[PDB]
Amino acid sequence: SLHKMSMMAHRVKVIPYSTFRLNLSVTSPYNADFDGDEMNLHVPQSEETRAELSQL
Amino acid sequence: VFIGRLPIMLRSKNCYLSEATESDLYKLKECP
Amino acid sequence: NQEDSMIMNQSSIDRGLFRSLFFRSYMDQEKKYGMSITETFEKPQRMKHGTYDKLDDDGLIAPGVRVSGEDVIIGKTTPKRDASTPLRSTENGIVDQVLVTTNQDGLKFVKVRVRTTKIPQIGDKF
Amino acid sequence: RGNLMGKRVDFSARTVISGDPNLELDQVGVPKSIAKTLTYPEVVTPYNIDRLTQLV
Amino acid sequence: MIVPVRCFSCGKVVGDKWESYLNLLQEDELDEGTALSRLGLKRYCCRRMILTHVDLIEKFLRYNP
Amino acid sequence: KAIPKDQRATTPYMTKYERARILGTRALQISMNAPVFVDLEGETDPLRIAMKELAEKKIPLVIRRYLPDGSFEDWSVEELIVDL
Amino acid sequence: KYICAECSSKLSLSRTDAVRCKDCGHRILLKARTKRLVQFEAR
Amino acid sequence: EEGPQVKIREASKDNVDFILSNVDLAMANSLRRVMIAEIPTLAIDSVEVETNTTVLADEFIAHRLGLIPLQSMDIEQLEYSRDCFCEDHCDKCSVVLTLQAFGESESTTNVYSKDLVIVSNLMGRNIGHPIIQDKEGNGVLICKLRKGQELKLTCVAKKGIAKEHAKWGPAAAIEFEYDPWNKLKHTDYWYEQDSAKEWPQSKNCEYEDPPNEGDPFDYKAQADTFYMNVESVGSIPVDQVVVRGIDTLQKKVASILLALTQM
DNA sequence: ACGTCCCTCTCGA
RNA sequence: AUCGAGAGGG
Ligand SMILES: Nc1ncnc2c1ncn2[C@@H]1O[C@H](COP(=O)(O)OP(=O)(O)OP(=O)(O)O)[C@@H](O)[C@H]1O
Ligand SMILES: [Mn+2]
Ligand SMILES: [Mn+2]
Ligand SMILES: [Zn+2]
Ligand SMILES: [Zn+2]
Ligand SMILES: [Zn+2]
């Protein structure tokens, strides 16, 4: 985490098994891979903030 | 006259495990 | 298995492949306090929100008990002022073995061993 | 540098991250067990009330 | 940790043919890859099941109680 | 102590940040049970409810762009453009 | 109740009564499966 | 004669061999596929334990029992515990089994599949028997006991399809090939200097023919004639594991119609 | 003079 | 629980 492209927002898609799952082509901007890497997740507690995270 | 006592390493000199064989080590619950 | 991941044949681990087998262990001691004022292990009546009822009155739980969540393992008590020792928040297993004896001081000493198996679940390192 | 210019945050997550050809760029496959413990204040508004009362 | 029942790969009953494998290589004294081959294993998946098994159960039993 | 529109100078377009705070802001209000103006064509959601308002410039809000020296040019959502 | 080791006595001994393989002599002592049946899936 | 005609190649105790002439690949595949995991069989499912001094854990042995093959010949006479009416299980839905073993032998003493025993009503249907393919007839080595180790557990044996768990795996390995001389060009090869003399003719090229190099490629070349060999652990005979392959499929397609004409 | 971000365990006064 | 030391994970 040293740049904007590494703290992008997403739409949720609640799924099974204990693992966060993300599209292969948003790998890079995070420089993440699928061999042991955890990842963080936050969640705005409001509306405006969601907008701030959706429209920015 | 007394001093205290000294941590000993296993399989060393002054330990029993130096003394044991496959058979013995087993009933000593110790690993071969 | 894209970008360094591995898609793994479920039916083949269904046959038992890469099946782990875990064990934690918990300890405790009746900790005196000078005037031969000693601790102990019990089932009580400030206490903690577990579900002791898996205990035997002696302050324990015995092999075969399928334990989960935050269910007391050991019910130690101190001058009442609860002192029991619950399961680990994260984990959910099945008691395996437990050992009582006395310290260098000669007071009670209980170490509980709870087993469990682990299973190749999507997202496990290899 | 520890308790202001940075702190820790309620409402946060973590896990192994795997990748998904059958998914869209802008969404992230979060597991249930996070979605069961990941809340979110929402007001009672006639446009949803007929929903919130089915979640409660 | 004992012989596992049949094969991880195609799941073919192989729990059984263990003790029968031992005497084939010992009692009859023959080649490893001929003992398995003559127990009806041509898929190297099953073959890998036997040839690479360590029977640490034996060290187990050897303990006091 | 203020600027008069006749002498305005700042971007006449609306900024990613103006908008997204505006869509945000009203959307919060709306979902706080606020009087909505555009006519719901059936929107439970308040981000969209606001967004329709946005596409009918039926949002009673003034951005107050501040300048480095202190003074500010007000700008109606009715009057800002929207391209981006 | 409580067992042993080097020998594996079927001992037992309710509360407050010391601890030792009195039949042998090694304060190890286990605690035996409650006759409670438990069940595990064959999977 | 009919349609998708067939001709056995060999037949045996554990394997069966056949060319499905005039069959569609999507079929021979989808058949293959259901043969693997969608044919019903029986296998231990629950297991409670009363005494287990062995070295292997309780659920250790647990997982091991579920994988012992059971007789399943007549099995449709048992109906899925889950779909039956009895508060949990009964004799209508489950065979029950029990295993006593104690280390009396001063040597090292074995428990097998033979050592199992059935303690419920059979109701006169071929069920619940732990196949023995064994030469010695002694079954499958489940555990090992030093003179003093005991094992008391009992096994509720319900009906399952591999789709839920491998143990209800009637099948094993299923051989599959077709079009040996790659006449349909269904697979680009891989060679350093010659493709031919490096990729070895499969053991089937003799029932099809070489291609007469000089002649060109036919673009109307269709998939037909498939070389298969199926094998069952024994839970079910090998004719039933192929034919109740076909059978299951029919039923699968079937319930399409069934819920088709409901709407 | 400060000396990359975060995270999971385990242990001695 | 708190501080102190230690091995690993990206
Ligand atoms: N010491 C470190 N400091 C910061 N980030 C690190 C560090 N070690 C690893 N990372 C992060 O982990 C990622 C790459 O590490 P990793 O070893 O997984 O790379 P890799 O290429 O998979 O390993 P391999 O090189 O064996 O293929 C990057 O996103 C990087 O920022
Ligand atoms: Mn990597
Ligand atoms: Mn990595
Ligand atoms: Zn195999
Ligand atoms: Zn004793
Ligand atoms: Zn029933």
Which tokens go with F25?
């802001």
% helix / strand / coil in chain C, to the nearest 5?
A: 5, 25, 70
Range of the domain at G4: 1-43
Compute the distance between CA of residue H246 and CA of residue A15 in angstroms, rounded to an integer: 35
* Length A30 CA → J10 C1' (Å): 13
DSSP SS3 for H97: strand
Q: Residue H241 contacts by C-beta under 8 Å, 6 or more apart in sequence?
A: H35, H39, H170, H171, H230, H232
Annotated active-site residue C4? The verdict is: yes
The C1' atom of I8 and the CA atom of C93 lie apart, in whole Å, by 20
**Interchain proximity A35–C4, CB inside 8 Å:** yes
Q: Output the CA H190–ligand 2 centroid distance in Å.
A: 29
CB nearest A47 (choices: F17, F19, F27): F27
Q: Could you say which residues 15-44 of protein chain A have a Cβ atom less than 7 A away from any atom in strand J? A: 35-38
Alpha helices in chain A (DSSP H): 48-54
- In this structure, is the CB of residue A47 within 7 Å of any atom belonging to strand J? no
Q: Which structure tokens are listed for G32? A: 């035996």
Structure-derived torsion over alpha carbons of residues H55, H59, H60, H61, reported in degrees to the nearest 10: 80
Residue A6 Cβ < 7 Å to strand J: no
The answer as to CATH 1.10.10.60 being correct for domain E1-65 is: yes
How far is it, in rounded angstroms, from Cα C46 to Cα C79? 11
F-chain residue closest to A53, CA distance: F20
Mutate to test the pocket of ligand 1, among C2, C4, C125, C126 (most ligand atoms within 8 A of CB): C4
Quote the tokens at residue H79: 């109906």
Q: Which ligand is nearest to the CA of G6?
A: 5
Q: Which domains does chain H have, with CATH numbers?
A: 2-40+167-263 (3.30.1360.10), 41-166 (2.170.120.12)
Closest chain E residue to the Cα of B26, Cα to Cα: E63
What are A's interface residues with D at a Cβ cutoff of 8 A?
10-27, 32, 34, 36-43, 45-46
Of A6, A27, A34, A35, the one to substitute when testing ligand 1's pocket (max ligand atoms within 8 A of C-beta) is A35
Contact H70, H54 (CB under 8 A): no
Rounded Cα distance, F47 and A6, in Å: 25
Q: Which of F16, F25, F27 shows the shortest C-beta gap to A56?
A: F16
Rounded, the Å distance between the CA of F61 and C1' of J3 is 54
| Annotated domain spans of chain E | 1-65
Q: List the helix and strand counts (H, then E) for chain C.
A: 1, 3
For strands D15-19 and A20-22, give the pairing: parallel
> What is the tally of structural domains in chain F?
1
Closest CA in chain C for residue A18: C123
* First CA to last CA distance, chain G: 32
Please state the residue numbers annotated as binding site of A for Mg(2+). Answer: 33, 35, 37
| E49 within 8 A of E4, measured Cβ to Cβ | yes
CA atoms of H90 and H85, how far apart (whole Å): 9
Residues with CB under 6 A from ligand 1: A 31, 33, 35
Q: Whose CA is nearest to atom 27 of ligand 1?
A: C4
List, in order, residues 6 or more apart from F36 with CB less than 8 Å away.
Answer: F30, F49, F53
- Rounded CA separation E56/E63 (Å): 12
Q: Is C115 on the interface with H (CB under 8 A)?
A: yes
Q: How far apart are CA E7 and CA E45, in angstroms?
A: 7
Q: Tell me the structure's resolution in angstroms, rounded to a single decimal.
A: 3.0
Angle CA E6–H38–H99, to nearest 5: 45
For B19, the token pair is: 């003394």
Q: Which residues of D touch C122 (CB under 8 A)?
A: 18
> Would you list the DSSP string of H176-210?
EE--SS-TT--S----SS-SGGGSPPPTTTTSS--
G37 to chain H, minimum CA–CA distance in Å? 6
Nearest-angstrom CA–CA distance, H102 and D5 = 67
* H156 Cβ contact partners less than 8 Å away, ≥ 6 residues apart: H44, H45, H46, H47, H89, H94, H96, H97
Q: Which of D14, D17, D18, D33 to mutate to test the interface with C (most CBs of C within 10 A)?
A: D18
Q: State both tokens at G22.
A: 């009195």
Superfamily holding C20-119: RNA polymerase II, Rpb2 subunit, wall domain (2.40.50.150)
Nearest to H100 by CA among H155, H44, H50, H151: H151
Q: Which residue has the tokens 């009637």?
A: H170
Cα separation, C37 vs C79, in Å, equals 8
**Strand I footprint, Cβ within 7 Å:** A 1, 38; C 24, 90; D 1, 6, 8, 14
* Distance in angstroms (rounded) separating the CA atoms of residues D47 and E29: 82
Helix or strand or coil: residue E38? helix
Contacting residues of C for D19, CB less than 8 Å apart: 2-3, 5
- In chain G, how many domains are there? 1
D8 CB near a chain A CB, below 8 Å?
no
**Beta strands A38-39; C94-102: pairing state:** unpaired
Which atom from ligand 1 is nearest to the alpha carbon of A31? 29
H56–E1 C-beta distance less than 8 A:
yes
Residue E52 neighbours by CB distance under 10 Å: 7
List the CATH number of the domain containing F42: 3.90.940.10
CB under 8 Å to H64, separation ≥6 — which residues? E2, E4, E5, H56, H142, H143
Best mutation target among C14, C15, C17, C21 (most E Cβ atoms within 10 Å) is C15
Rg of chain C over all Cα atoms, to the nearest angstrom: 19
* Whether the Cβ atoms of residue A20 and residue A39 lie closer than 8 Å to each other: yes
**Residue F83 main-chain phi, psi, to 5 deg:** -120, -75
CATH number at G12 reads: 2.20.28.30
Tokens 């056949």 label which residue?
H18
**Hey, are the CB atoms on C122 and A35 less than 8 Å from each other?**
no
d(CA H71, CA H77): 13
